[PDB]
Structure formats: structure tokens, C-alpha cells
Design a protein around this ligand. Structure first.
Ligand SMILES: *[C@@H]1O[C@H](CO)[C@@H](O[C@@H]2O[C@H](CO)[C@@H](O)[C@H](O)[C@H]2NC(C)=O)[C@H](O)[C@H]1NC(C)=O
Ligand SMILES: *[C@@H]1O[C@H](CO)[C@@H](O[C@@H]2O[C@H](CO)[C@@H](O)[C@H](O)[C@H]2NC(C)=O)[C@H](O)[C@H]1NC(C)=O
Ligand SMILES: *[C@@H]1O[C@H](CO)[C@@H](O[C@@H]2O[C@H](CO)[C@@H](O)[C@H](O)[C@H]2NC(C)=O)[C@H](O)[C@H]1NC(C)=O
Ligand SMILES: *[C@@H]1O[C@H](CO)[C@@H](O)[C@H](O)[C@H]1NC(C)=O
Ligand SMILES: *[C@@H]1O[C@H](CO)[C@@H](O)[C@H](O)[C@H]1NC(C)=O
Lengths: 90, 49, 202, 49
């Protein structure tokens, strides 16, 4: 180790469990409320409506998501699989 | 924080019906005191050596 | 105020430590350089003088390094404050959670000693109501989608209201657009559209 | 060794204060990133998104 010569290491205030809890809370807020919880009280919304809401922010009309929702969901799942596989391969 | 759960459903939405105008204070320092230090008055006193 | 007090207390304590450094001998036989000159000859007391010079140089170098790091931090904070002024004060910033918690409207800068404060004006909702929503409305096989609002229902009828306020309105053509057929959305509801041109042509 | 360290006790004061400030800044860095919300939102048991 590196502590035998008086070079003590201070433990962090927040453990990894608390950081994981914070990240999970942020994830739940961003899938169940979108951005309402980040600027006030959390408001319930369906995820397809939130995805169309994000689509409206980039100049694409929301009518295109619901026509090919399965395609976008499959693309999202494949991208999640791809990043999970790439991170396992530093 | 407060352990609370958000009711989620595929056909449930929450539309606010009222608002409150709030004011948030943010403190930001932009400057500090300007000091000048010279060796001849600090390191030396009144001695030429 | 915590941010404005640290930048003054740290500088004051650094100045106090600089003053305290002259009260130490740094391993010599005296602290003041006049005492060794008065009690010892300059040819012999040269090494004590040089040791004092090295100690004072080290203390001054450490003070200069600390002040440079503090000045870098102050420069970063001043850049942040300038960007905050130019965005939140000289206009309305679309960056969420940058000009305060909530939907920013404007900010009012105020003078502060060796600093600046911003009185942001946010927009947070207060009371909300649960509603049943549908992403599309099937009128005559043509799916209607809201232009800027969202379809809501109070249990019996349907309305369209904006995102951040509840303003119920009758489902009409002026705020909805058609796209494709009806059998494309996984979740749709049956309803009718006002079409306010029909009663006026009679 | 300790008796000659009183001639440089001020230096030890600056070093200890700098390390304490570094530690408290490291502690404050995590609070500014992850503690954005003060309410812990529970994941709903329904996974049909
Ligand atoms: C929105 O919230 C504001 C703030 O509470 C409400 O204003 C209050 O209304 C009550 C009753 O009408 C008054 O007794 C208070 O004096 C009001 N307070 C202020 C600061 O004006 C307002 O009524 C709410 N609006 C709705 C539609 O519920
Ligand atoms: C849901 O909204 C509808 C539309 O506003 C309500 O129906 C109206 O209710 C008012 C209130 O008494 C009546 O004066 C109108 O004659 C109603 N119109 C129709 C077409 O029925 C309805 O009451 C609301 N329901 C709830 C539970 O709030
Ligand atoms: C919404 O409307 C559509 C069409 O008006 C309904 O679809 C019809 O359903 C009946 C029996 O459920 C069938 O006999 C028809 O052939 C269907 N027509 C079409 C064009 O699909 C649908 O059932 C309605 N939904 C609800 C919940 O009432
Ligand atoms: C709306 O109703 C649901 C259950 O029907 C409940 O979980 C939710 O908290 C309610 N929302 C409000 C704002 O009362
Ligand atoms: C919402 O999800 C429930 C549970 O899977 C399902 O029974 C219901 O049909 C869904 N409604 C819509 C509109 O998709």
C-alpha cells in the first residue's frame, strides 16, 4: 500500500452505493418525467410522448415517431447492445 | 432525499394548472484584492549587505 | 455569503502567513537580519544572511504560486460570471438549469464587493393534475396529431393544452395536422374534430 | 528533527491547509454533479416503456 509513511488516504464523503443511488434516481426521473423533474415537480408522461417531444426539439415533426416506433425502439436496443459490447472490449 | 415514487403509465400525463414565480440567488466572485510585493522591502530591511 | 468571504479570508491569511514568515530564523541564530550584523562581523555572518535569503525566497515563491493558483480560479469564475451575465442577463437563455432551478425568464445583476450576484427569475409549476392522454386521434381514418399541445381527457371528453399550463381547448383543425392512415400508432383513440369551416359555409 | 521544524511551521501550516482545501474541493465536486435533485425517484415496477 501507500499508507505506511504517514500518507493517509481520506475516504470520500459519498460512497459508490450513494452515487449509484443518485444515478438511478436521475435515470428514473429522466425516463418517467423527461425534464419536468429537473425544473420543478416531477410530471408523469409516457415515454413515446417524451420521445416525440425530443423529436420536436430538433426540428422533426412528432408524426414520424409513432409511424415507426418499433424501428426506433429496435435501433435504441441495438445501440445499447453495441455500447455494452464495446465497453467490454480501455 | 425524500423516497418518493412517480406513478407511471402509458396513457397518464400530468399537466400543471398553476405556477409560482420564484427568485434564485447565485453568488459569483469576479475579483480579489490586488497586492504588490517587492523583495527589497520584504527580504531586506535597511541594510545594504 | 460563502463564496465572497473565502476569497478575502484566504488572501488575508496568506498575507498574515507572509508576515509570520519573517519571525522565523529558518535554522539561523536570529530572525531579524540587523541583530546578526550588529553582533557578528559580516565576513562571518554571511552564511546566516544567505540562509535567511533562501528562506525568504522560498516563502515568497510559495506565496506567488498560491496567488497564481487563486488568480487562475478567479479567472475561471469571472469567465463563468461573464457568460452568465451575457446569457441570463442580456437576454433569455434556453440552457436548462444554468440560470437557476426552473424555466428562466430574466436575471437582475447587482453589484457586490469583489464579486457579483444574479437575481434570476425562474418559472416553476406549482399544482398539477393527472390526465389520460393519447398521442393521436382517429377521426375518419386520418390520424390527427397536435401541433404544439398534447391531447388530454378529463374522463368524458378530450382537449388539447400546452406543455407548461392547463388551457383546455376544443379539438379542431387549426391546431392539429393529419399524417398517414389510422393503423400506424400502437395507441390511438377514437374522437371527432370540430372542423370550424363546416358550420360557416351553410 | 522536530525542534528545527518550528523554524518552518508556517510552511507546514500552508501545506496542511492546501491539502485540506483540496480534500474539501474533491468532496464538493461530487455534490455538484450527482446531487442535482433532492428527491429520490423510484423506478416503477412496470417495464413496458
Ligand atoms: C395559483 O397560486 C397562487 C398562489 O397561492 C394563488 O393565489 C392565491 O389565491 C388565494 C385564493 O384565490 C388567495 O387567498 C391568495 O392571497 C393568493 N396569493 C397570491 C400570492 O396571490 C392562485 O389563486 C392560484 N391559482 C389557481 C388557479 O389555483
Ligand atoms: C369534462 O369536461 C367536459 C367539457 O367541459 C364537461 O362537460 C361540461 O360540464 C359543464 C359543467 O357543468 C356543463 O355546464 C356542460 O354542459 C358540459 N358539457 C358537455 C358537453 O357535457 C364535464 O363535466 C367534465 N367532467 C369532469 C368530471 O370534470
Ligand atoms: C375506433 O374506430 C374504428 C373504426 O371506426 C373501430 O374499428 C372497427 O371495429 C369494429 C368492431 O370493433 C369492426 O367491425 C370494424 O370493421 C372496425 N373498422 C375499422 C375501419 O377498423 C374501432 O373498434 C374503434 N375503437 C374503439 C375502442 O371503439
Ligand atoms: C393521479 O392519479 C394517480 C392514480 O390514479 C396517482 O398515482 C397520482 O399521484 C395522481 N396525481 C395527482 C397529481 O394527484
Ligand atoms: C398500457 O400497458 C398495459 C400493460 O401492459 C396494457 O394492458 C395496455 O393495453 C396499454 N395501453 C396502451 C394504450 O398501450
Amino acid at each position: 500500500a501507500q499508507k505506511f509513511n504517514g500518507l493517509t488516504v481520506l475516504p470520500p464523503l459519498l460512497t459508490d452505493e450513494m452515487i449509484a443511488q443518485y444515478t438511478s434516481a436521475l435515470l428514473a426521473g429522466t425516463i418517467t418525467s423527461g425534464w419536468t423533474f429537473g425544473a420543478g415537480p416531477a410530471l408523469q408522461i409516457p415515454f413515446p410522448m417524451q420521445m416525440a417531444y425530443r423529436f420536436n426539439g430538433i426540428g422533426v415533426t412528432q408524426n414520424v415517431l409513432y409511424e415507426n416506433q418499433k424501428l426506433i425502439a429496435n435501433q435504441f436496443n441495438s445501440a445499447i447492445g453495441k455500447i455494452q459490447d464495446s465497453l467490454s472490449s480501455a | 432525499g425524500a423516497e418518493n415514487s412517480v406513478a407511471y403509465s402509458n396513457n397518464s400525463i400530468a399537466i400543471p394548472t398553476n405556477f409560482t414565480i420564484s427568485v434564485t440567488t447565485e453568488i459569483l466572485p469576479v475579483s480579489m484584492t490586488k497586492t504588490s510585493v517587492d523583495c527589497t522591502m520584504y527580504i531586506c530591511g535597511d541594510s545594504t549587505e | 455569503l460563502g463564496k465572497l468571504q473565502d476569497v478575502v479570508n484566504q488572501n488575508a491569511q496568506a498575507l498574515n502567513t507572509l508576515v509570520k514568515q519573517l519571525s522565523s530564523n529558518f535554522g539561523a541564530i536570529s530572525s531579524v537580519l540587523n541583530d546578526i550584523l550588529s553582533r557578528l562581523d559580516p565576513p562571518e555572518a554571511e552564511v546566516q544572511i544567505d540562509r535567511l535569503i533562501t528562506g525568504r525566497l522560498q516563502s515568497l515563491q510559495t506565496y506567488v504560486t498560491q496567488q497564481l493558483i487563486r488568480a487562475a480560479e478567479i479567472r475561471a469564475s469571472a469567465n463563468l460570471a461573464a457568460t452568465k451575465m451575457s446569457e441570463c442577463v442580456l437576454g433569455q437563455s434556453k440552457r436548462v438549469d444554468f440560470c437557476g432551478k426552473g424555466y428562466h425568464l430574466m436575471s437582475f445583476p447587482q453589484s457586490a464587493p469583489h464579486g457579483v450576484v444574479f437575481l434570476h427569475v425562474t418559472y416553476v409549476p406549482a399544482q398539477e393534475k393527472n390526465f389520460t392522454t393519447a398521442p393521436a386521434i382517429c377521426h375518419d381514418g386520418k390520424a390527427h396529431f397536435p401541433r404544439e399541445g398534447v391531447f388530454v381527457s378529463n374522463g368524458t371528453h378530450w382537449f388539447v393544452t400546452q406543455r407548461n399550463f392547463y388551457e383546455p381547448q376544443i379539438i379542431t383543425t387549426d391546431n392539429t395536422f393529419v399524417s398517414g392512415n389510422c393503423d400506424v400508432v400502437i395507441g390511438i383513440v377514437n374522437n371527432t374534430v370540430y372542423d370550424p369551416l363546416q358550420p360557416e359555409l351553410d | 528533527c522536530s525542534n528545527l521544524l518550528l523554524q518552518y511551521g508556517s510552511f507546514c501550516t500552508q501545506l496542511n491547509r492546501a491539502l485540506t482545501g483540496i480534500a474539501v474541493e474533491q468532496d464538493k465536486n461530487t455534490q455538484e454533479v450527482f446531487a442535482q435533485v433532492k428527491q429520490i425517484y423510484k423506478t416503477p415496477p412496470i417495464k413496458d416503456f
